[PDB]
Amino acid sequence: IPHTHAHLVDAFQALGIRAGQALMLHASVKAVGAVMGGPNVILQALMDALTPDGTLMMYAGWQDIPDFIDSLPDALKAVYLEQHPPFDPATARAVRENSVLAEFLRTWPCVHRSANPEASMVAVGRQAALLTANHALDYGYGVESPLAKLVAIEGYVLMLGAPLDTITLLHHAEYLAKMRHKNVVRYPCPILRDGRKVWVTVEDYDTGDPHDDYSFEQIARDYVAQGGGTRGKVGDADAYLFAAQDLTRFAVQWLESRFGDSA
Amino acid sequence: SHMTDLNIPHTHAHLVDAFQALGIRAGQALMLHASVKAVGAVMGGPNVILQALMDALTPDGTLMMYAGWQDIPDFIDSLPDALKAVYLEQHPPFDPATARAVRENSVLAEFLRTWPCVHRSANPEASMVAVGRQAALLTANHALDYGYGVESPLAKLVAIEGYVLMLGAPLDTITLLHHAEYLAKMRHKNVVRYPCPILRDGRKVWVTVEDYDTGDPHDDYSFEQIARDYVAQGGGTRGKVGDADAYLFAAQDLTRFAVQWLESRFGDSASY
Ligand SMILES: [Cl-]
Ligand code: NA
Ligand code: NA
Ligand code: NA
Description:
2 copies of one chain form a homodimer.
Chain A: H1 5-15, E1 22-27, H2 29-32, H3 39-50, E2 55-59, H4 74-83, H5 100-106, E3 112-113, E4 121-125, H6 128-132, H7 146-152, E5 156-160, H8 169-176, E6 184-193, E7 196-205, H9 216-225, E8 230-234, E9 237-243, H10 244-259
Parallel strand pairs in A: 1-2, 1-5
Antiparallel strand pairs in A: 2-4, 3-4, 5-9, 6-7, 8-9
Helix pairs in contact in A: 1-3, 8-10
Organism (chain B): Pseudomonas aeruginosa
Family (chain B): Belongs to the antibiotic N-acetyltransferase family.
Protein name (chain B): Aminoglycoside N(3)-acetyltransferase III
């Protein structure tokens, strides 16, 4: 029988979700199991556990970002340059692989959306404007990102049936970590500037492959093994709750101990 | 050298022209039924289907879709009593700001429901969403009972001489024909009464909704058959939009034809 709102609230509170927290969510709707009222109730139950003083954020990105066009034949590239729509934060759909829940949150009342297309974050709650403000186009997981601000205000990461490899915050750890090798990429993206479509080039660390011989799954598993975070069931899903500051510190040290400065 | 297929997704500019070639004009009010898969790959995804159609209509025009409510708990009377009790306490009400569109109504209905400047009608099961000049008029004052009847966006679409566009969607899915069913003097139409949670003064209240059955026809017909007959006698225009077969119908003429079609076959000549 479908999970109720009240039971989801109870489960979130038992895991350690508290009023006033700033929380980034990664989720699998299927892992939670049938919810009475659908995935909207997952979000509402989580927001009720956080209260209006808390904040809920998710990585939306842009499902249709044309960041692959530079490698197309010039005839095809020219059509994209002329006809592909720009990133419009009011309509750009969330990456489907980021969970339908991210698209649900993107379209929630009072949502705020950060301006970086590829790294776009959506948030609802007391610190939603703070977290999403001034998200620079370059190095979108770095110093000017909602992930940096989540660490800075000592927020949390909730894994709700999502694989540990999907923790976007670990790209911020990659940015911070002093490492022997990094891949830097430049890619095209159409944006709105003065209400007009303009193509820009974005520079970032590669986030499609690791910079060295590691995976996020490995880092997060090691974090849990040494006592990091709390674990529990929410609906049918295995859930993990991590402090963003402690996890980032751990992950930076993990990367630097294996790939960092020997001097 | 042999001929090569570039395989370019459909562009906004080509979709706009394909809609215009069907006969979509500036200022029209248009209800859309669609299959995203039938259109094929579009450069920018389904948002571009909607924007291209809105651009053909211009801001003077209006685009509407049937959204409904994916999570409507209208089936609770068939559940064991103790499970019905849980639904009555814990199922959320229809909140028009967040209630998700029926998935079988196309993801495009959910995309339009979340579009800037959208207006949404208040009937949960029959909820319609619209963007454009007459979106407020079309969606206003949608009565809870008989949601496809005289107090509905479909009645208003007919009254403003609007249109229906089938974009790779089966002809059986023309929601307007439920308005024809409502209007038609038929021998017998099945009435349903079902519970639904709504918001009243900001609080959840469960109400009883009365409507004609829209899950099954009232006699031995299908909407596909009515529409096929309409096309066969010259009704509408047709053309390709992307990879999809498209049909464009005038709502007033289609409704007239469908009412007469139903009354000619399933009317009642007895004088009570
Ligand atoms: Cl209430
Ligand atoms: Na609340
Ligand atoms: Na700190
Ligand atoms: Na703190």
